[PDB]
Amino acid sequence: HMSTLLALDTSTEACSVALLHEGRALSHYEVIPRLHAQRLLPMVRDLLDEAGVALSAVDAIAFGRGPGAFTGVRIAIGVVQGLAFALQRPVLAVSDLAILAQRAYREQGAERVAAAIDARMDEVYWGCYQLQQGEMRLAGSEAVLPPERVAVPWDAAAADWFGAGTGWGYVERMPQRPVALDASLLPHAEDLLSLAGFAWARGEGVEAEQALPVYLR
Amino acid sequence: MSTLLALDTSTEACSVALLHEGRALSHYEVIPRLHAQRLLPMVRDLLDEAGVALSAVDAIAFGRGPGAFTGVRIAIGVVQGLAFALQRPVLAVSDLAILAQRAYREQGAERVAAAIDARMDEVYWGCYQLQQGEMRLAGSEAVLPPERVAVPWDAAAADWFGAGTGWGYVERMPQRPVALDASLLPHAEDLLSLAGFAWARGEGVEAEQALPVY
Structure with a gap:
């Protein structure tokens, strides 16, 4: 049944x-x-x-x-x-971090996405996702973090992962950054x-x- | 029905x-x-x-x-x-009206100044009078320092009642009712x-x- x-x-x-x-x-x-x-x-x-x-x-x-x-x-x-x-x-x-990841996958074709959403008080919500049979799937866990502490579960120097979300307004403070990002994606x-x-x-x-x-906090 | x-x-x-x-x-x-x-x-x-x-x-x-x-x-x-x-x-x-109707049910008070504790040292405020079984608003509802609340009736003409957590501030209020219930929700x-x-x-x-x- 459908x-x-x-x-x-x-x-x-x-x-x-x-x-x-x-x-x-x-x-x-x-x-x-x-x-x-x-x-x-x-x-x-x-x-x-x-x-x-x-x-x-x-x-x-x-x-x-x-x-x-x-x-x-x-x-x-x-x-x-x-x-x-x-x-x-x-x-x-x-x-919503997964939703961002799924959207970035659909629109950019990115199969690895670091999703970041601005949080209150000098922190960001953070979650990294990877395609698994058409579904952007969470690797590790989601967190709320100073931008200085966010990390990806894959090799950072790899040029295939994408940054999605308003959290990427803090990119200059992160310990790594992707080749490409969209800080306005919702x-x-x-x-x-x-x-x-x-x-x-x-x-x-x-x-x-x-x-x-x-x-919710 | x-x-x-x-x-x-x-x-x-x-x-x-x-x-x-x-x-x-x-x-x-x-x-x-x-x-x-x-x-x-x-x-x-x-x-x-x-x-x-x-x-x-x-x-x-x-x-x-x-x-x-x-x-x-x-x-x-x-x-x-x-x-x-x-x-x-x-x-x-x-919820001010609800307080009024409850004070009427529990105390028979037909004139109720309802006061709810609001943020930042203020109260939510509204005065209600009984009209054919229903506590109806007299004047307006407002958020106000306790020092500035007023009733729309002549406070001396008839007893009125204080309902709600705002009345924890009663001693800072310009006027005071004959009876109040500050724990009423x-x-x-x-x-x-x-x-x-x-x-x-x-x-x-x-x-x-x-x-x-x-």
Whole structure:
């Protein structure tokens, strides 16, 4: 049976939603600072309506669980939980560092990505990812670190790995840097949707009442 | 007869309430040091207890603040998600109003100056008077130094009552009520009362317009 998955991300100034239905992906993306709580659900209604898909057809709901903006992530968490509780469908928490990695893979073809997202207080969120059967997969663990301490799990002098995310604003303070980077790249629900597909096929998914594997500071 | 679901988490406590067939049911609990909000399982437990399906709910009421930032954000998101999935209206209700309605229920006070401890040595402030069973706002709500709060009534004309954690600042306030309860928190049961008035007036809005007050 083919899965129907709904994906949304509000971790940044970007708000985006994506839908998998009958093996087709559909997404929409807007930059709208501070207007997430008012614009997220209409984006969802429009996406479902454009696809001709009813909310009841959705098998699971995926969202970016951060790291990123405090308010944006918290909005996603609540809305997804509410949606999922009412439908009685599971939720899929997905890292925004992974989403960045998957996006950089899709757009640049980079199979090794060091994702870095600006954190508060002179630190960055940091996670390195490598392609594994179409999925950008975490090598090691994610961390929040002074830029001086970030490290990659592969040979640094190799010219094939790519730097993605606003954390790369701190590149001049890092102990290594890639040949190429994009410090303005943001999460995109389309790539969240890709990651949710892999996670859903592994049998992941949590019910709304269940303790959420999202750990905000 | 309406079926109304009420959610309040504006504090370090959590409560839910259901109006069904003219009968009200509520549950209230404090949230321990290392535990997170128990909102959705409390909702589940409430509905199961009342023998009511979530799909039978006509509208969802919530405390829209003021109060805590986090408690507001994720819980208001939950209200949005539920209401959207169910295709049902939401009823935004002031936590100051909820305090007033609760003080009325628990003390019979028909004039309540509600005060909630706000950040940076200030209180959230709003005065309410009873109007046909419902505590209605007199004047405006504000965030204010304790030294600058005022009541809209003639304080000498009738007794009024102090409700909420803002009244921990009472000795810094220009005036003082005959009685106060500084430990009083919002409660879903009294939110449910207010929601009913609001619903019977036909005041519901769509899920995307469920916003916190700030």
